[PDB]
Amino acid sequence: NFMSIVNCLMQLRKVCNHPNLFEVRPILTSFVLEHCVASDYKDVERTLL
Amino acid sequence: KSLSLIAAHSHITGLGLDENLQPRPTSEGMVGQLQARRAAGVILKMVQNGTIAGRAVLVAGPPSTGKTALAMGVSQSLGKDVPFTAIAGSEIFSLELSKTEALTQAFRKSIGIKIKEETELIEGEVVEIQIDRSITGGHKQGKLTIKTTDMETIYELGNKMIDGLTKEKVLAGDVISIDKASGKITKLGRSFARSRDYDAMGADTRFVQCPEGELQKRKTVVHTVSLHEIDVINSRTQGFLALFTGDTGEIRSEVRDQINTKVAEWKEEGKAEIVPGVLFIDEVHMLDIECFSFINRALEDEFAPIVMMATNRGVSKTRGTNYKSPHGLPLDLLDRSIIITTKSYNEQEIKTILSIRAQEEEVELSSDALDLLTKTGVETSLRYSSNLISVAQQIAMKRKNNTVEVEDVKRAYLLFLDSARSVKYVQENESQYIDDQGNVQISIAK
Amino acid sequence: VTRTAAHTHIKGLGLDESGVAKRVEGGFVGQIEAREACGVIVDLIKAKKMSGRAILLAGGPSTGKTALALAISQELGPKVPFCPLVGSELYSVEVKKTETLMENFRRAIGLRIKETKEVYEEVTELTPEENPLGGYGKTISHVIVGLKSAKGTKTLRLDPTIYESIQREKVSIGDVIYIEANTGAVKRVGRSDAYATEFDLETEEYVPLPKGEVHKKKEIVQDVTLHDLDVANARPQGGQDVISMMGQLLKPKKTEITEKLRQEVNKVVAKYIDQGVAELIPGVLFIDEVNMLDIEIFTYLNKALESNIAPVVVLASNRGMTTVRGTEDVISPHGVPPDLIDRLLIVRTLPYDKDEIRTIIERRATVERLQVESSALDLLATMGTETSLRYALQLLAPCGILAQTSNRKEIVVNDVNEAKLLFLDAKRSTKILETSANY
Amino acid sequence: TRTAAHTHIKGLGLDESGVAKRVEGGFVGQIEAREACGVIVDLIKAKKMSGRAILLAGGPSTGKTALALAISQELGPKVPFCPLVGSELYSVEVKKTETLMENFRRAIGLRIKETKEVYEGEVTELTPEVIVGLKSAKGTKTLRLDPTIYESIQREKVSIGDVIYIEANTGAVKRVGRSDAYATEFDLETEEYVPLPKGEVHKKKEIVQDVTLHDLDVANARPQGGQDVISMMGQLLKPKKTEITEKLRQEVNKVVAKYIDQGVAELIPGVLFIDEVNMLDIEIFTYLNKALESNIAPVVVLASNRGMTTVRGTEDVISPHGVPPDLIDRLLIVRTLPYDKDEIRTIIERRATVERLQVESSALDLLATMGTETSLRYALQLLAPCGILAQTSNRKEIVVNDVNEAKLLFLDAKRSTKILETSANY
Amino acid sequence: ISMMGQLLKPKKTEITEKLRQEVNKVVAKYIDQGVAELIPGVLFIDEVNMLDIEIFTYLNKALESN
Amino acid sequence: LNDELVLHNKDGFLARQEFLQRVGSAEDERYKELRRQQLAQQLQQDSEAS
């Protein structure tokens, strides 16, 4: 659309503060893939035994 | 589905044939190989019949002549619901299981059973749950209200299933399925009721739902399980974990015998059906004499699936021995099997295959470019052209034109070498590469 | 809708009462001498006297050795164990090959045991319980339980221990249970079916009421093998602490079962046999392609055979004068070391003839539910005699498929020719392999 | 700084037209190989093909490993790149094919977006069911927690007045430390103090963490749970890796396909580099031949410096570069050429200028003549001893005397072999 | 850890060099105080012809330790 | 400092922002489609009822 003063403004922000105003160093933690496969075969196992 | 990038046999969609088991000149991906295609169709019909066990067919021929392509075609035309286990000969040698045990597991994986049961189901929109405390008159006074498309009714809970609905946070106004005997509660999402009430939840609820019919019905549940899964399940306390971790560890024979007896009793009791799928072995020459000897006996078992074999060589030394045998297989195993041969490829067939690959990889080729690719394929090999056609696409994009011309193919040919040219260059300057004895000359001078 | 696999057209040795083999009976044709010898061997096995006898069948490929062994197994009966193996199956990874050979050796002999048990089976009511008068902080003297059954009800009194077992089961008052007074264990069969519709839903299966008298006297007979007892003693399943169950969680890998355990098991089995409770029944151990065995297992077979409870071992081999695998300069017949073949007996299998091949093809066609012509059958027999017996039997099925495609129920000469052109055999493949540039 | 035989190579040095400049990006010569590598890089960037296999063949000291590293560096840190040697496939606890498939899965990557919910602040009460009265610097809220997270809390020996930090997605619990309010309770109190966290007790964040297919395959193949004792003992029960069944791979593929279809993640195929493929045996070659014709395989590049040699594992099967002909047929070969005098001199000058060393013209010419006479790597490696010898004499510029003394002190392969042959005692 | 050791049949493991160095350091400290004494012994190996060349090569280095 | 800067910008920081905004647009479009289909179903049911 148009953007010409925001460049200078956020450049000023980066020169002034530096490592913030977008993101910080985060607290690292594992991904939480959650679909799993145990419940898929639990019914089959219970039927089998 | 099954999100994939590309495969060397991606264009093949289930062989190609008629209702009379006659092969069309070009259909469903593959061209030519009429006799081999008809033989594969006969094998497929035999597999679909399911009344014949333990047949061995060996597909043999020169390399790069529709062997794995034919296997993919028959596997695709066989469709789902019938097991098809494709393995390579080099993945049987393992440090955890003996080759006999791995071969047995591969054989068992290729045969499935469908267990059919009948269960009553309760479905509909739930509108309100009421739960009480523990009282002398009644341990728990709980009631459930269910609304279908035509019926509203009241159920009374019997002191246990309330733990079922309180184990996970469920709530009214949604369609749920509950089994009378099983007792499992499956929340399918959110009911329809009024659109506005569930139109501002931020997607979720799996595109909601609307009640369809009555409260309770009787349905049939069919479970398809391979035999090997049954042995793994019954081997240990929790074998279904081993179905993913792969630490079965040479299941004992008593378990297998018990599984066989129980499955047979089910079959003549009408409680389960047997689907005898297919086991395919690529590069069978990589196997061992012990594996072949075991296969000789494993083929004659009652629960033996149809076995397909693919080999390249002819009259080579079998692994584990010191004598030369045809196809890299012993004489007795060859006698036990039926051989399907494949021929070379014509220039017209090469051109048709290249055009199919072009239209598969969304690449446009000019007529002269296709002619040059066909000439190179006839001169050197099919796979070299099938790779050059894809590698020339980037060169074409570098010139800011989508169409591929003769110059792009020439540039690709002059950039990426070939087996014959590389061999000639190596023989011309053998003093620079590492010799067989390890002698190398590195200094340019002298 | 019945499946077939290279067999099931044989169901016996086809011998009369006197042991004379009829030419065509039980699915067999020809091989009169081998059938008679195998019948004598199965008679000796039924005699239940010997221990460690060894038979080896010799002959070329596709001559009937495996069919003979399966016929012996069919003749013996389902009760007597019959353990089949391939020579390459002994090379295990978890344990040494000698241990696997001994395990399969012990898997062949069996034991039939019997045990008489009493049992009690709808629960009507139960009352738990006197004065401590000592060091009993909480006393439960006895528990009175009444059962309903079908053929009359009855009440009884029982120990506090079985009451704590019931509490562990946590049964209600309107239930059906299963209490075995031998081990003092109660099993909750479930609710009572007539107690249904108390609530609109109930997860537990209601189960009908037990039939007959509540106090049931019965006897049970089970067939096991000595290997089952060895496995049970080696890896006991009992235990409630953490260590026992977590050991049960790990994968069960074969170990080197000690000799002392086997000796103790033998002593206990002998003591039980002397009481008449149980009786033993030797079985058969069958080995295919014994030429796949190396010299170590062959040597250990000499020690194993001369044991005291060794079963009857039947061995198959089709090699001629070959080097025994595991050594490089030992030419032996059938690839079996001279001492072992000195320890066993030999049964020769003769090659078939044209008429026998034709009859075999006809029998296979009949057992496969197919229709063939006399001219087509003659062409198939000539084809088999030209290439191999197995080739015609394998080629029969695609001929049937081709016949079914053209809406014709009978195998005819052109279908056989088309199958010949479509599917090749070993000889033609060998003849067209070397006559080409690329392999 | 630190240099090791590289880091003077910063890319293929190509322009927009794809024509390789003679000297660009720490590269001289090798125009055809650089152009082919750029074409392969564009093909990889297309993210359409799968299982494409090229190998680059040439004599020693010709830049094959340098070309592979340049390809990896030009692709960017976003695209995964797995380097390997032929000898790594011979593991101890798993079969070679399983290790190769593990590397194959490791080669490609998946970028996903997730939302993480976090609670933190001071603890006001702790009553068993567990109910936790968290209180931040502005807000207060009570939460109900599972028995497992309660056990993790107990193992953290938390108490009233301890600022803590709970994560809802994973159940991870970390006690930040004693609140600053009770900063006067013991004059030599060992416990550290932390101010109350700012903002409301419940916060939500969106992250774009990347992963690989092998990562989320081993995630459910074997766990690395965390602070729970039961999970600890479960992960301790099995300490060895094992072969993964194809069913787990298929379920992983289905889950990943559902994720990418839902518009939550994207797939980025990577590259698998195998240096010295001649160490592979026939079985691994056959299995790689089979696995290349898959629908998820990445682009594999192979490096070899061999003539017409015998494939390892066979007796008399001879082939070029020690690669079986069947695998050669589905390969794209890239030739590599030897160098010349001026190219060697330029490479020596670049390696001198990256190591912040000053070499005069005569010394550079002597080094170039030496490199032509003996080898390029020897001339490159003799730079540092020359620098130290110059420094010992309290100088900065390499002189002819320095290279002569370096020649005297250290020997190349030719002179070492000559002194080996003409000696009595081995 | 005790349960893991009891449930695993603890076959021998290649003891790291760090543990040996720590033991050597503490033993040296203790013998410095006069409470402990060192006594070198004898290692007798008969039928050394059965040793492999790798064991001989490792013995070459091992004999030069202090 | 040119080369490491070029590499890290090839990874980039705004690239993550563009990916996040693409995901946002995707799920917003999915929600809009769900809303439109539910409104169409409600309208057709209402027209059928009357």
Ligand SMILES: Nc1ncnc2c1ncn2[C@@H]1O[C@H](COP(=O)(O)OP(=O)(O)O)[C@@H](O)[C@H]1O
């Ligand atoms: N009849 C055919 N139709 C289409 N493609 C074919 C055909 N025959 C071979 N191909 C091509 O050849 C390749 C597979 O070669 P293949 O026959 O598997 O070699 P090999 O026999 O050595 O395994 C595939 O990429 C496939 O596209």
Ligand SMILES: Nc1ncnc2c1ncn2[C@@H]1O[C@H](COP(=O)(O)OP(=O)(O)O)[C@@H](O)[C@H]1O
């Ligand atoms: N006398 C016979 N009567 C009927 N069928 C026979 C006879 N001899 C061999 N066969 C058949 O030949 C087939 C293959 O013979 P087989 O016993 O496998 O040979 P081998 O002894 O080499 O294993 C078997 O399926 C069997 O049914």
Ligand SMILES: Nc1ncnc2c1ncn2[C@@H]1O[C@H](COP(=O)(O)OP(=O)(O)O)[C@@H](O)[C@H]1O
């Ligand atoms: N075009 C080049 N520019 C600069 N250095 C090069 C060039 N080609 C090769 N080298 C150097 O030659 C050495 C050998 O390269 P490498 O690929 O690692 O081994 P090889 O070339 O023997 O396969 C590397 O240290 C590399 O720095």
Ligand SMILES: [Mg+2]
């Ligand atoms: Mg193939």
Ligand SMILES: [Mg+2]
């Ligand atoms: Mg046989």
Ligand SMILES: [Mg+2]
């Ligand atoms: Mg190199």
